[PDB]
């Protein structure tokens, strides 16, 4: 007994029976195609990690940029469509600098996440502007930064909803990686332990054996700014594991 009519999934701005709005749900399914990314929030800081998924050896590893810097205080890790990710990263950067210009201060991670979320919401097309993509943004972002409230990790999804999360995983193996996060995570863990645990989980989920090339790792601590672990630092930690 199979009923597969759907007939309402096509076209945003259509509420299907039971009012589910399936285009956005399919966009939320889309990030599972992306590489797994992982974030852990700790008192010492917030760390972000992602698997690069290098297709060929000739491709330059540095060019793959799945962790980026919105500003010194906030960094982002993304999984999903690289292009619309670039769009949202641009929105985040310009909004941070606009806040600096207007108020001579640094945005909070929640405010930056809300700023990008407002842009993500515009798929509904309530605004009359032509230059807004009709489709929802097929990307999920992890916003990690140290603010007045300390280390904070925010998750953003294609819907534009956002929440703080002590630890979250996005991408293909988010299911199962989140269970591993739930068992390992305790609020007291230091950033060293968080880095090690996140790399353990990434090693588990990743098809290829983990190496300094195929992962990208970053941390923002209260004293420091956003920092990316270099080849040597990545070598040290992946050796320590």
């Amino acid at each position: 007994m199979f009923l597969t009519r759907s007939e309402y999934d096509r076209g945003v701005n259509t509420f299907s029976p039971e009012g589910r709005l399936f285009q956005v749900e399919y966009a939320i399914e889309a990030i599972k195609l992306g590489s797994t990314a992982i974030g852990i929030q700790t008192s010492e800081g917030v760390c972000l990690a992602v698997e690069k998924r290098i297709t060929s050896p000739l491709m330059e590893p540095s060019s793959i940029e799945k962790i980026v810097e919105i500003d010194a205080h906030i960094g982002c890790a993304m999984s999903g469509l690289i292009a619309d990710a670039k769009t949202l990263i641009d929105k985040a950067r310009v909004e941070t600098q606009n806040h600096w210009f207007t108020y001579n201060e640094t945005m909070t991670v929640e405010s930056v996440t809300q700023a990008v979320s407002n842009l993500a919401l515009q798929f509904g097309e309530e605004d009359a502007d032509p230059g807004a993509m009709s489709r929802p943004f097929g990307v999920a972002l992890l916003f990690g930064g140290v603010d007045e409230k300390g280390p904070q990790l925010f998750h953003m999804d294609p819907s534009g909803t956002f929440v703080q999360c002590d630890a979250r995983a996005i991408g293909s193996a988010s299911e199962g990686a989140q269970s591993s996060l739930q068992e390992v995570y305790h609020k007291s863990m230091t950033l060293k332990e968080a880095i090690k645990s996140s790399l353990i989980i990434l090693k588990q989920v990743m098809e290829e054996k983990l190496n300094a090339t195929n992962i990208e790792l970053a941390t923002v601590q209260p004293g420091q700014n956003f920092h990316m672990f270099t080849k040597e630092e990545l070598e040290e930690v992946i050796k320590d594991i």
Binding site: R5, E7, Y8, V12, N13, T14, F15, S16, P17, E18, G19, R20, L21, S117, N118, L121, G124, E125, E126, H155, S159, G160, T161, V163, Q164, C165, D166, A167, R168, Q178, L181, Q182, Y185
Partner: protein, 239 residues
């Protein structure tokens, strides 16, 4: 079949029903429950928050529009955020222009117009979110609900969201005492009402409850996880 007449808001059905609007009204049922009730001196909003996972924080279900108005949402958070921005700008405009707090009834009228425009035109979908609006003005405490259909109501009490009929029947049988209640009694009544909606295994906690109070002397304040513990402690247990 009748798969036709369901595609768009602009198509009437052979029995005078716009099915897309009803499908939007189904959206409020999806969200976590919310309850609102008022006394002669106060208006209260209480909510059941949901979390994607244990590690994730609970979502924000109560939002402050102004000192004298605040809302709680059931249905799409996107539409909720958009409508909240519109309401906030309307209240700011009223304060700038007339230097008076906007009447809550007039604000819900504006919400109704803005929400109605999508339903009639091709293009933008109906706002698939249901809001409970609670505020104090010179006339007194007020509670309104707005449907994804632009129709709005004025209520002694109301509950929206999943499994809200249980809260509605509790509220109806206990409604008479609400009017003369203290704010503590009133928030306790609302907490029990939303407790009706919860699964039997689940129980009210500091985490999953948010409370929103406004009154003659009290501006709209959302009492968060730590701050709900004074109000929650009074409640006895599940029946």
């Amino acid at each position: 079949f009748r798969n036709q007449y369901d595609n768009d808001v602009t198509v009437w059905s052979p029995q005078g029903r716009i099915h897309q609007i009803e499908y939007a009204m189904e959206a409020v049922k999806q969200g976590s429950a919310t309850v609102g009730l008022k006394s002669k001196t106060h208006a209260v909003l209480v909510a059941l928050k949901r979390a994607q996972s244990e590690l994730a924080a609970h979502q924000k279900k109560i939002l402050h529009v102004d000192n004298h108005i605040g809302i709680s949402i059931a249905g799409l958070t996107a539409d909720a955020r958009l409508l909240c921005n519109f309401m906030r700008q309307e209240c700011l405009d009223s304060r700038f222009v007339f230097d008076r707090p906007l009447p809550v009834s007039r604000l819900v009228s504006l919400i109704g117009s803005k929400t109605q425009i999508p339903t009639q035109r091709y293009g933008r979908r109906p706002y698939g979110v249901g809001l409970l609006i609670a505020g104090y003005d010179d006339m007194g405490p007020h509670i309104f609900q707005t449907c994804p259909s632009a129709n709005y109501f004025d209520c002694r009490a109301m509950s929206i969201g999943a499994r809200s009929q249980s809260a509605r029947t509790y509220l109806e049988r206990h409604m008479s005492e609400f009017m003369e209640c203290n704010l503590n009694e009133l928030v306790k009544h609302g907490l029990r009402a939303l407790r009706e909606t919860l699964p039997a295994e689940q129980d009210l906690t500091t985490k999953n409850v948010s409370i929103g109070i406004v009154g003659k002397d009290l501006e709209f304040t959302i009492y968060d996880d730590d701050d709900v513990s004074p109000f929650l402690e009074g409640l006895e247990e599940r029946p």
